[PDB]
């Protein structure tokens, strides 16, 4: 099992995108997904002010600049991987479809309809 | 005890003592519309069930004993298994295909009873 | 006579003869939503009261005599004062803190009665 960095695609997919401190970061994760099987690691990041949200074309927004210095601390809680592939398999970061970021939290929930009427035999007569 | 649907895995005769627990749980313009549709629907669904109980002569009751005989072809089981072994979910699946037949028969026996009671007055 | 709430200052036993008077009075997109919310609410409030009367076995009645004993701890008064001296507003304040207890007891006596009536059939 080998890890590799992302495959070609646009910036919004090939990098780790997130919004923090009010600004949109595009970080290069190749330093995290470069290994066979299994200080600190520094990932360089790019910043954009013009943002095309989700996968839409036609609605762009301008992120106002944020005054001062931005520092964010967060918890990585999971990964979205895609398998590149019978003797070896390579996993790469993937995603870009935001539904998979919610699918990961809503997996425990199901919605059901209550149907309160029912009939059953009993030994009685009106 | 347990609240809403806490009896779901209990047997049919252990359950059906909690009928009031479930009965009471049936009760920017775009968000306003979605919320209203959810609320109107809850009301219409509630009223369809109440109308149907009214048609069958079971208005105002949670347990209604009728005069329709049970067909062994709907479920050939003895009361001991249905009420002491099975859960309501299992039962609902077992007789799903006969529900419309049963409902039709309940409507009909009520129409006859209701007319007979008029003739007696 | 007087219409809606005209009996509000009358004594409890002078009032309660006008129950149908009050019962019948319970029944640009933004304005449309506000009006609908007011109307949906009126319906939901109405139905919650009707559901509750149904649970207590009082469906279809304005005056419903039940089988729950009165606790002297809820209000230690004789019928003569409650019905001939007090108004309904005063009474509601007097026993406000026992309302939920009373409602719980009414629900329970109905569940028992309803089951006993099934066993008798």
């Amino acid at each position, epitope marked *: 099992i080998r890890f590799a960095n992302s495959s070609g695609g646009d910036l919004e997919v090939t990098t780790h995108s997130f919004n923090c401190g009010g600004e949109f970061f595009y970080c290069n994760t190749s330093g995290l997904f470069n290994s066979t099987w299994i200080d600190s690691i520094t990932l360089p990041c790019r910043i954009k002010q013009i943002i095309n949200m989700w996968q839409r074309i036609g609605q762009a927004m301008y992120a106002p600049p944020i005054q001062g210095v931005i520092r964010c601390v967060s918890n990585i809680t999971g990964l979205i991987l895609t398998r590149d592939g019978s003797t070896t398999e390579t996993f790469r970061p993937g995603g870009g479809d935001m539904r998979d970021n919610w699918r990961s939290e809503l997996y425990k929930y199901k919605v059901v309809k209550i149907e309160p009427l029912g009939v059953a035999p*009993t030994r009685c007569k009106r | 005890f347990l609240g809403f649907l806490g009896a779901a895995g209990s047997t*049919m*005769g252990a359950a059906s003592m909690t009928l009031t627990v479930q009965a009471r749980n049936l009760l920017l313009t775009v968000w306003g519309i979605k919320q209203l549709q959810a609320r109107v629907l809850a009301v219409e669904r509630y009223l369809r069930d109440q109308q149907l109980l009214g048609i069958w002569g079971c208005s105002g009751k949670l347990i209604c004993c009728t005069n329709v005989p049970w067909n062994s072809s709907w479920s050939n089981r003895n009361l001991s298994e249905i009420w002491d072994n099975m859960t309501w979910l299992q039962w609902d699946k077992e007789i799903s295909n006969y529900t419309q037949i049963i409902y039709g028969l309940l409507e009909e026996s009520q129409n006859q009873q209701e007319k007979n009671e008029q003739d007696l007055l | 006579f007087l219409g809606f709430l005209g009996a509000a200052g009358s004594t409890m036993g002078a009032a309660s003869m006008t129950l149908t008077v009050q019962a019948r009075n319970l029944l640009l997109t933004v304005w449309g939503i506000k009006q609908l919310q007011a109307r949906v609410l009126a319906v939901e409030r109405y139905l919650r009261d009707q559901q509750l009367l149904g649970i207590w076995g009082c469906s279809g009645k304005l005056i419903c005599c039940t089988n729950v004993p009165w606790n002297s701890s809820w209000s230690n008064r004789n019928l003569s004062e409650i019905w001939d001296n007090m108004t309904w507003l005063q009474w509601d304040k007097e026993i406000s803190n026992y309302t939920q207890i009373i409602y719980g007891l009414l629900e329970e006596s109905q569940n028992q009665q309803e089951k*006993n009536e099934q*066993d008798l059939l």
Partner: antibody, heavy 124, light 109 residues
Framework: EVQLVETGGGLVQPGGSLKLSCRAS????????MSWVRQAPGKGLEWVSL????????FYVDSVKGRFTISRDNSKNTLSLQMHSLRDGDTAVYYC??????????????????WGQGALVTVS | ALTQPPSVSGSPGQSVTISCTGT?????????VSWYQQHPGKAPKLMIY???QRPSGVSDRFSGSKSGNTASLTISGLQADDEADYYC???????????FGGGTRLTVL
């Protein structure tokens, strides 16, 4: 194996009262309806009273209807029968018996499955 | 109530029949006619219930049936251990729940 054990006094004067009881074991008490049956010293059996499994419904033979009370307590596994007024004609062995009715959601019985040995009650 | 006061008898190995006569709005219309066996000094035991059924623990020497307004209990391979009083009873509807007949003494010869 189940047991029904009748207890209670066996001697009263007419015009008085007497409480009998029946302790049950070996089965779920609360699942069965129960009755009392009299055996007159020189005759046969007579049904006197029946109580529902939950204690909600009670039935009596007309001859004791205004005098006897049948009660049940499912937490102690016991029945009780409270006799009042009492006549010489009420002398009998009073048997505790399991059965008599049904619970609606279960097959009916309408017969008596288990019997105790009986308390002897004499009205002098 | 129900009736059958005389004794019934036969020798070991002979069958005997015990009748129980009631009325239409009683034993005739309700198929709930149990039979009980009472050895003197003991509480009665259930032998037959409903009409033909027996409790587990009851031998097949005991069986029965009904017709019209009369029920009966049949004992086949009569034993000395069958010397007991037998009673029939029946569900007699609501209000009058149960009635019993007098018992019959079964004598083994």
């Amino acid at each position: 194996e189940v047991q029904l054990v009748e207890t209670g006094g066996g001697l009263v004067q007419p015009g008085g009262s007497l409480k009998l009881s029946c302790r049950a074991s070996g089965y779920t008490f609360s699942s069965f309806a129960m009755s009392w049956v009299r055996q007159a010293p020189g005759k046969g059996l007579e049904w006197v009273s029946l109580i529902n499994d939950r204690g909600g419904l009670t039935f009596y033979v007309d001859s004791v209807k205004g005098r006897f009370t049948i009660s049940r307590d499912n937490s102690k596994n016991t029945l009780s029968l409270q006799m009042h007024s009492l006549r010489d004609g009420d002398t009998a062995v009073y048997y505790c018996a399991t059965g008599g009715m049904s619970s609606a959601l279960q097959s009916s019985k309408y017969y008596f499955d288990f019997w105790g040995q009986g308390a002897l009650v004499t009205v002098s | 109530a129900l009736t059958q006061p005389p004794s019934v008898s036969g020798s070991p190995g002979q069958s005997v029949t015990i009748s129980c006569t009631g009325t239409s709005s009683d034993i005739g219309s309700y198929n709930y006619v149990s039979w009980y066996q009472q050895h003197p000094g003991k509480a009665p035991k259930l032998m037959i219930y409903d009409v033909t059924q027996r409790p587990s623990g009851v031998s097949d020497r005991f069986s029965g049936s009904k017709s019209g307004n009369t029920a009966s209990l049949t004992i086949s391979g009569l034993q000395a251990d069958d010397e007991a009083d037998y009673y029939c009873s029946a569900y007699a509807g609501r209000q009058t729940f149960y009635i019993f007949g007098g018992g019959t003494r079964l004598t083994v010869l």
